[model samples]
Target: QIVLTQSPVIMSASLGEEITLTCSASSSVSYMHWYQQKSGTSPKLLIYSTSNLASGVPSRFSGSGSGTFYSLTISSVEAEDAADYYCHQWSGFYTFGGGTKLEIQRADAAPTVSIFPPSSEQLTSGGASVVCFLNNFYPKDINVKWKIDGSERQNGVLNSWTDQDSKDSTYSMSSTLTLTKDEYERHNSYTCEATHKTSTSPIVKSFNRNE
Candidate 1:
């Protein structure tokens, strides 16, 4: 299987700034396809067959490359251009590059963190769900994770990151954790830890079943 590497896991751009995203394949690829995905939406094809623009994609979006190296360039970034971009190739075998998150840089703001407990109905079903909500945040670079008894918990968790809306003043995101009833009852403490550029220390919020 071929592997494609995309540069700059995250990139920030000012309004009307020009930017280029690069993707390099482990081996030669017949062609490359590029996609743009905003938060909570399916990725839309931006470029097809290396350099052809997909239908309805703006002229500002263009692609150019040959052999194993390829690039997607934005002539001028717009507020709506903030999204994750991916490069894909399937000349013989299918392969995709890790996405590059394109963010519109903004002034920093501290995000408010809160955790919600599962409903009784969920508990009765022999499982519990906890949600960590992050609101009013600026800048897309934030980390949120789940922990039990101060140890990181990776399984049974879903995490999402969203870009700030151009029309809106702030950004919001959430992470959900699910646990079996037995596991829930066995854990004495479940916590959501968050960190952002605005904070020197991680923001911690706990979910108490009693709450």
Candidate 2:
């Protein structure tokens, strides 16, 4: 699995000013994905492969540049665009960029946050459960929350962490969320939020039936 790092938090910007968020992988990843996260809401997809816009994303929001250095840009910035931005790589196991928090520099801000997924898929089982494996995170303190259509889920089993190797000296941890066939289909939308002591905000990624 690859590890990603991003700026902790960023100040607000003015309209038409360029805003850039960077994601770096421990090793070269063929592609990277970006997301936006706003206050009091979930994250949404923005860009993929460093440039391509995901379905329904605004044209003003674009991603470009690549290699170890990749970024997500918002052209002619609007008030609603103020929020956190994140990046992830799916070369193999799912991995996320650290995350960047955007705060409006001025008052009367109409902030909008975005979130991205490294990868996601729907699972079905014949009287069985589906499992999604996540990459490890450092600091040994992480929580995974499973939700359906923005509401918290009560069913499902989560497993303990397993040791994993990483390029950097930071420690790593992993977990699994299990759901039955009926629950998986009924919920349709599944999200996993990773938290760590070093993280300014929780790193969240969601999967839906439509995706």
Candidate 3:
């Protein structure tokens, strides 16, 4: 899969204002997905395939366009949506865009957060494995952590790193978690957290069967 890139950071906007972040793919992609990340949580999917909603995402966030260029937009800015937004593609190996951090300019910020799972499926061992992926982030250092039911996961194996090619200016990274059927089924809720030394807080996302 190709890599996606986004602006390093965006400014806090006024309520009811439109906020937009641009995402560019390394090559032409069939569709693009958007995600949101908040403090102390995992990344959440917001927009998929340019404009598609993942599962329980709010209506305020929307995506548009195609090919090498795309955008994720927020209508009538809400305080809760005040986090980081990312883009992804699934035509091949999973790929994500750099993240854009959003904050409210005023006190009336609405809290509309959405997290999207790039891909989730049942594993051969009867458990489920999920991939949390992102690409082209600035400052280079990013890490991912897995959690079960709000607690730090201790048993499941976790792996993550960043990759770069001489041909490309952007760098990419991914985090993978392998879980057994019992652990996967028992928690029912899983989370992935992304962190960087440059960031004051980590971006977090969560997934639950109930949602």
For each candidate, the alpha-carbon lDDT, in order, equals: 0.86, 0.60, 0.66
lDDT by residue for model 2 (5-48), tens: 78645645655677776777777777788998765568888998
Please state the error at residue 13 of candidate 3 in Å.
Answer: 1.7
Clashing pairs in 1: none
Task: Give me the runs in candidate 1 sitting further than 4 Å from their true place.
Answer: 110-134, 140-163, 166-169, 173-211
Candidate 2 segments whose C-alpha is farther than 4 A from its true place: 107-211
Which 10-residue window of candidate 1 scores lowest in summed lDDT?
A: 161-170
Report the C-alpha lDDT of model 3 over 1-211, residue by residue, as the tens digit. Answer: 6888786466556667998888887788888888788756798888766788778887877889777888888888765666777888876578777687765554321111224432344545476665666555543456666777888775555554433222222335666676666556676677877676545566677888556
Q: Score candidate 3 by TM-score against the native.
A: 0.48
Question: For model 2, where is the 10-residue window of minimal lDDT?
Answer: 109-118
Candidate 2 lDDT: 0.60
Q: Which candidate would rank higher by lDDT, 1 or 3?
A: 1
Compute each candidate's TM-score over C-alphas: 0.62, 0.48, 0.48
Q: Model 1: per-residue lDDT, tens digit, 94-138?
A: 889999988876567888999887878999999888899988788
